[PDB]
Amino acid sequence: SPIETVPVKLKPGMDGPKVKQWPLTEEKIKALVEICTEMEKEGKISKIGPENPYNTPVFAIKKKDSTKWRKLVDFRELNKRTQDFWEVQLGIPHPAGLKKKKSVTVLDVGDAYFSVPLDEDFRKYTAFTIPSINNETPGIRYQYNVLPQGWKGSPAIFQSSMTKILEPFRKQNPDIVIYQYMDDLYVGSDLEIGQHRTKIEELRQHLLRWGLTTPGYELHPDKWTVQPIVLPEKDSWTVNDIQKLVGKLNWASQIYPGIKVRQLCKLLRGTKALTEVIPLTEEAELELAENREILKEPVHGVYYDPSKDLIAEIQKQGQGQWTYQIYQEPFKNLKTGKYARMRGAHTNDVKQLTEAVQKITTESIVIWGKTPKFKLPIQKETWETWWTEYWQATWIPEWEFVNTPPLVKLWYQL
Amino acid sequence: KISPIETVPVKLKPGMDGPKVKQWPLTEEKIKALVEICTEMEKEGKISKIGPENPYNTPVFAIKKKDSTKWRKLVDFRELNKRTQDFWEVQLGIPHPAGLKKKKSVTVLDVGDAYFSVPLDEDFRKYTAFTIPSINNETPGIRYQYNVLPQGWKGSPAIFQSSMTKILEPFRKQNPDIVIYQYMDDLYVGSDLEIGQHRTKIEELRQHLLRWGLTTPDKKHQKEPPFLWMGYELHPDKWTVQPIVLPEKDSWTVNDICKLVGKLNWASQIYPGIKVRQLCKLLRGTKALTEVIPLTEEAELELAENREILKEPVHGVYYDPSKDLIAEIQKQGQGQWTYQIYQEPFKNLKTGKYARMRGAHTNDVKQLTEAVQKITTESIVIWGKTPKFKLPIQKETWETWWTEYWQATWIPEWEFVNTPPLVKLWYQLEKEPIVGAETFYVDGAANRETKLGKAGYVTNKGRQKVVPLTDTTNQKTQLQAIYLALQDSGLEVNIVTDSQYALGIIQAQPDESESELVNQIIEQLIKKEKVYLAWVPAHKGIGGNEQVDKLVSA
DNA sequence: CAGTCCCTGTTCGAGCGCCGG
DNA sequence: GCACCGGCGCTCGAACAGGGACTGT
Numbered sequence A: 001s002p003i004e005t006v007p008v009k010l011k012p013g014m015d016g017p018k019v020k021q022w023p024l025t026e027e028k029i030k031a032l033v034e035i036c037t038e039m040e041k042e043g044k045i046s047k048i049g050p051e052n053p054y055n056t057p058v059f060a061i062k063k064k065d066s067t068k069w070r071k072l073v074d075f076r077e078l079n080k081r082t083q084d085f086w087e088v089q090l091g092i093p094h095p096a097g098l099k100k101k102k103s104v105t106v107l108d109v110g111d112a113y114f115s116v117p118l119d120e121d122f123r124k125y126t127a128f129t130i131p132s133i134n135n136e137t138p139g140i141r142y143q144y145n146v147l148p149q150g151w152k153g154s155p156a157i158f159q160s161s162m163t164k165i166l167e168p169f170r171k172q173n174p175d176i177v178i179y180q181y182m183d184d185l186y187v188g189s190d191l192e193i194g195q196h197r198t199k200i201e202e203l204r205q206h207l208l209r210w211g212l213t214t215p216g217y218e219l220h221p222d223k224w225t226v227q228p229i230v231l232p233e234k235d236s237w238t239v240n241d242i243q244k245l246v247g248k249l250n251w252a253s254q255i256y257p258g259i260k261v262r263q264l265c266k267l268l269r270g271t272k273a274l275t276e277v278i279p280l281t282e283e284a285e286l287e288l289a290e291n292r293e294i295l296k297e298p299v300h301g302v303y304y305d306p307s308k309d310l311i312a313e314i315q316k317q318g319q320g321q322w323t324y325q326i327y328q329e330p331f332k333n334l335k336t337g338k339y340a341r342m343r344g345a346h347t348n349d350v351k352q353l354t355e356a357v358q359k360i361t362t363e364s365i366v367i368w369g370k371t372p373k374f375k376l377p378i379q380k381e382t383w384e385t386w387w388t389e390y391w392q393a394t395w396i397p398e399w400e401f402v403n404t405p406p407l408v409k410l411w412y413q414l
Numbered sequence B: 001k002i003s004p005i006e007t008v009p010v011k012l013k014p015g016m017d018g019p020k021v022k023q024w025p026l027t028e029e030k031i032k033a034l035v036e037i038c039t040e041m042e043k044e045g046k047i048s049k050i051g052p053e054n055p056y057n058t059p060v061f062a063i064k065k066k067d068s069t070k071w072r073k074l075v076d077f078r079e080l081n082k083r084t085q086d087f088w089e090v091q092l093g094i095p096h097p098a099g100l101k102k103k104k105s106v107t108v109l110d111v112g113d114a115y116f117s118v119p120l121d122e123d124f125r126k127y128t129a130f131t132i133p134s135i136n137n138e139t140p141g142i143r144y145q146y147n148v149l150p151q152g153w154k155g156s157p158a159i160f161q162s163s164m165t166k167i168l169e170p171f172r173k174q175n176p177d178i179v180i181y182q183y184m185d186d187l188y189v190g191s192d193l194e195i196g197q198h199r200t201k202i203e204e205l206r207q208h209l210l211r212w213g214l215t216t217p218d219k220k221h222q223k224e225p226p227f228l229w230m231g232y233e234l235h236p237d238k239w240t241v242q243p244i245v246l247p248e249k250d251s252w253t254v255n256d257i258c259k260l261v262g263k264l265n266w267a268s269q270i271y272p273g274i275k276v277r278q279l280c281k282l283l284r285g286t287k288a289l290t291e292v293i294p295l296t297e298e299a300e301l302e303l304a305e306n307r308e309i310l311k312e313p314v315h316g317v318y319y320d321p322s323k324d325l326i327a328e329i330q331k332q333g334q335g336q337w338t339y340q341i342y343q344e345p346f347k348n349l350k351t352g353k354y355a356r357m358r359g360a361h362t363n364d365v366k367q368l369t370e371a372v373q374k375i376t377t378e379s380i381v382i383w384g385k386t387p388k389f390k391l392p393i394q395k396e397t398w399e400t401w402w403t404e405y406w407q408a409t410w411i412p413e414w415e416f417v418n419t420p421p422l423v424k425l426w427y428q429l430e431k432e433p434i435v436g437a438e439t440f441y442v443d444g445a446a447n448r449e450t451k452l453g454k455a456g457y458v459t460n461k462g463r464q465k466v467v468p469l470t471d472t473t474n475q476k477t478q479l480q481a482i483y484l485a486l487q488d489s490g491l492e493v494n495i496v497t498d499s500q501y502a503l504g505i506i507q508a509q510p511d512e513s514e515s516e517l518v519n520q521i522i523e524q525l526i527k528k529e530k531v532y533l534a535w536v537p538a539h540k541g542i543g544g545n546e547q548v549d550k551l552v553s554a
Numbered sequence C: 001c002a003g004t005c006c007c008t009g010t011t012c013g014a015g016c017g018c019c020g021g
Numbered sequence D: 001g002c003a004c005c006g007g008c009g010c011t012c013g014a015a016c017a018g019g020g021a022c023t024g025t
């Protein structure tokens, strides 16, 4: 709806997104057609022809505590292509405070963008296409007229108005922290579990009051905490046990350079049978516990660098357990952690992977204000086929796939 | 009649001008036959005569049409296509008859002179200038530019399809129950109306299309049960493919094996059992398309086996959304799979084939899994849903696989079908080291400058063995040493290596491979009873590993 | 110890064909 | 001496990555 739009540039050297629309299920094409026919009548999107060379895929998800479908667009590409606009020109400050909070509620304030108009010279970049079941008709192309939900540039433009709406609430609640990441609003407090819930209720009202709708849940930062690398505690040690132990230690030495293995290798002199029991020597016993000591106190010299990318590797541990590590430069981890099976959901390794992905990303937003690039333990096709069945987030992070077997039953396990 | 629809605004890539390429000399038959096409279009206003103010030129030619008699004017815009702005292709795929639902009345129409009935952007008409040379080249030939959509330009299909959708948008509003499968100018219009009342909407649709410039000549399938649409023959109950003639010849060139695999693949759509892997092996080693290649023995068998599937009529039934979708998979040969999507026992919808060899070292399970995926993906494309699978694998085989594998894996709702050859895991390495089994420490090195190498083992009991190797690599030698440790051992072995690479291959439990060395290491592991494989860090003081390292150094 | 070579494994797009228009 | 666009298959080569050796000051 008309006022004054902001001139949005693309970096001279980069071209707009040109991504192919992947296949969608009937249940969700129908959903998209309805949402799009609605959104067009309202004037949010417009029909375009093939002379617009750009595309960005669309789909639909079904959020938790919702039976209504949500139109999600995979803007990942356009974001990479407009990062000077959203990171440099119009940055959104990240508070180091919500990490230190007790409870943080996330709010889907994405609805607010549909009021603000998008620059004409940019509407072209936000083009998408709905497919048709069994290719009855060619795809129906559309483009945004308003700010899009999924673009990292929408909150950037809305900052102006968002800070105004939020100021009277902040003036009387200076102790409460509000961070904005895309369609979401992270709101944290050092208050009581019950009093938090009502301040959130007041905030909802405050926004609903300023014209913005917002249709235990909430995150507990300090209830996550970094889990260490740990060595087993055997009563008696075998040849095999010592070798597996030496392996763990050898890779671990790439993280903590002070770990010595010498005396453990001294116990392994000559070709012994794998199940022969070797008792521990005086110095071997000292090196065991001394190495364990270095794995008790985490690696020093781990500083976030806001220009460098966040990287995350996940490991499938089996029986519903999944471990993760986030770093920027290898062996120098910023955060490490587990991921347990949620109560009531059916066992599907992909649901678990996607769930894990979303958790870690949320943590990464809350902690750093950025999303990580994921090194996923799954084959490309397997993921590309079922990830959208379990997705419930408004953002989508970067990912690559990796096949790497567990040589040393992953430093992370039992 | 040319369409009164608004033009799609076209631009040329920034800083580039239009084509100034000369017309090549043509055949007298073709030139004479192209003057008729151009005279017909001028009087109909489809092209326009241009004077000395148009510096552009592009060559034209003509191809014969599918049913002959009439020509097709083509323009070699390979040059303008380069200087023209990119488009976004609106055609996302080819419609499949297995996706069509059972209709009471059908009529498939084709729109004659399709592209030559849609306006071209008034501003862009200049670069679409061509030249028809005279009968014997006297003075200049007639010039001409386009006022309509040219056959051979990058922008043409996307603009036409898009222009066809805007044409059928008003008619569909007034007729929601009518299914118009539109692919270019080929409209399969199908309804649940009675034959008399159906034929009336078709005349309303015909008249609608003629108000829009789009003519439908009297070569529109009326009510003729053998409807030829999209390379198929559609009967009211069932559909089949159009006649597929596979050519028999004594000597074959590489261009022919390409043509045969492509034909065979097309026919995989509904003829179950098609195999191409051995025929496809003849395209290996690049070579010329003109060069003759001899048909090997295993490929002669396959072409004969495929010839046998083809001389039999097979049909596929249409879709019933009130009934659910079933997909079934069979193992063919090595790395080859066939599936079939049905709703009822002998009544198939579509059949298929999965033969991709992704990776150097895979297994049946891994392959069955990517087969399941290929279907799921294309099922969502045709019916908008995923099917229930009937798979040749045990619930317990699958369970041992996924719970033990390091990648995340999943196959949808499926049921075990007891149809041999079954998909199984041929071995399973031990979680813990075998007590009462000999421990084999293995390593194997190679000199990268002389291409020579050694590979061997040393055991706890005192057993030892090193072997010289000819044209090896450092990785092959470490693989050779696992092979040795497996030959010279009992039913129960314990092998300990310092190679990530090798162990990595074996941990993934391969049952096939591109490498013969790896193939026989598998053959050996299957022959065993209990095998425990483990890893150790290279240049550390691991007594056992250290001993073999020295031995393989010279 | 660091670059550097080789091996081996990937992923992408190109090229050819098939079918459709 | 020959156009376009789409989907699929199949092979090849480019580009890239990781590990183990090598070499070198």
Ligand SMILES: Cc1cn([C@H]2C[C@H](O)[C@@H](COP(=O)(O)OP(=O)(O)OP(=O)(O)O)O2)c(=O)[nH]c1=O
Residues within 6 Å of the ligand: B065, B110, B111, B112, B113, B114, B115, B116, B151, B152, B184, B185, C021, D004
């Ligand atoms: C098969 C084919 C189609 N096309 C496009 C352009 C045609 O206008 C359109 C439809 O092709 P056809 O319908 O096969 O040809 P047409 O409609 O122009 O004329 P008619 O009905 O008289 O056969 O498809 C090409 O550009 N080249 C081709 O070789």
Ligand SMILES: [Mg+2]
Residues within 6 Å of the ligand: B110, B111, B112, B113, B114, B185
């Ligand atoms: Mg036609």
Ligand SMILES: [Mg+2]
Residues within 6 Å of the ligand: B110, B111, B184, B185, B186, C021
């Ligand atoms: Mg046609």
Ligand SMILES: [Mg+2]
Residues within 6 Å of the ligand: B443, B444, B445, B498, B538, B549
């Ligand atoms: Mg060695």
Ligand SMILES: [Mg+2]
Residues within 6 Å of the ligand: B443, B444, B445, B549, B552
């Ligand atoms: Mg060595």
